[PDB]
Curated annotation (Swiss-Prot):
Non-receptor protein-tyrosine kinase that plays an essential role in regulating cell migration, adhesion, spreading, reorganization of the actin cytoskeleton, formation and disassembly of focal adhesions and cell protrusions, cell cycle progression, cell proliferation and apoptosis. Required for early embryonic development, embryonic angiogenesis, normal cardiomyocyte migration and proliferation, and normal heart development. Regulates axon growth and neuronal cell migration, axon branching and synapse formation; required for normal development of the nervous system. Belongs to the protein kinase superfamily. Tyr protein kinase family. FAK subfamily. It comes from Gallus gallus. The modification Phosphotyrosine is found at residue 12. It comes from the Eukaryota. Phosphorylated on tyrosine residues upon activation, e.g. upon integrin signaling. Isoform 2 is phosphorylated on serine or threonine residues, but apparently not on tyrosine residues. The C-terminal region is the site of focal adhesion targeting (FAT) sequence which mediates the localization of FAK1 to focal adhesions. It is found in: Cell junction, Focal adhesion; Cell membrane; Cytoplasm, Perinuclear region; Cytoplasm, Cell cortex. Interacts with ARHGAP26, GRB7, DCC, PIK3R1, PXN and SRC. Interacts with the ARP2/3 complex. This is Focal adhesion kinase 1.
Length: 176
């Protein structure tokens, strides 16, 4: 009963890693050059696409109770991706003109709800797994993501002074 402990931690891990980037990029988002912007979207786009896969296998990993939310979360995630890719895609072309930092601001906002969402996903279902343990038959840290998240908020405040179909289509548009 300890062989399927690989994917269970994977989904819970990705939900954290992606968050680390969401904040990082939000830090150097302003100075974010045109050479780092191209790939920047790649990282974010990977979190969304990966989230679907990770969570997909996370369904059974968790106790049956949050299936409804998990299901709706799948489609929801997709929408978020297109939302981020689109915004970021704008600043990518609106950088050679002058409206660079402008479009960048929006990215931070959307990206903000992204990390929170990706986290809330496992955070919510977390009450299910624990609900069983803390009752009968019991048989990278949350706090870390909390503080870090808070920073992202301040960063934006001011300077330092089908589903599968869309995913595929976006890939082509992002490639060339």
């Amino acid at each position: 009963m300890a062989n399927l402990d690989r994917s269970n931690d994977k989904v819970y891990e990705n939900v954290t890693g992606l968050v680390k980037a969401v904040i990082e990029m939000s830090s150097k988002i302003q100075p974010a050059p045109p050479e780092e912007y191209v790939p920047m979207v790649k990282e974010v786009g990977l979190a969304l696409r990966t989230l679907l896969a990770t969570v997909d296998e996370s369904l059974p990993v968790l106790p049956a109770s949050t299936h409804r939310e998990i299901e709706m979360a799948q489609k929801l995630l997709n929408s978020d991706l297109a939302e981020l890719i689109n915004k970021m895609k704008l600043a990518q072309q609106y950088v050679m003109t002058s409206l660079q930092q402008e479009y960048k601001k929006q990215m931070l906002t959307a990206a903000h709800a992204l990390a929170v969402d990706a986290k809330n996903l496992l955070d919510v279902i977390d009450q299910a797994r624990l609900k069983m343990i803390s009752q009968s038959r019991p048989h990278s840290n949350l706090s870390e993501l909390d503080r870090l998240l808070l920073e992202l908020n301040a960063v934006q405040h001011n300077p330092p002074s089908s589903a599968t179909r869309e995913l595929d289509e976006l890939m082509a548009s992002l490639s060339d």
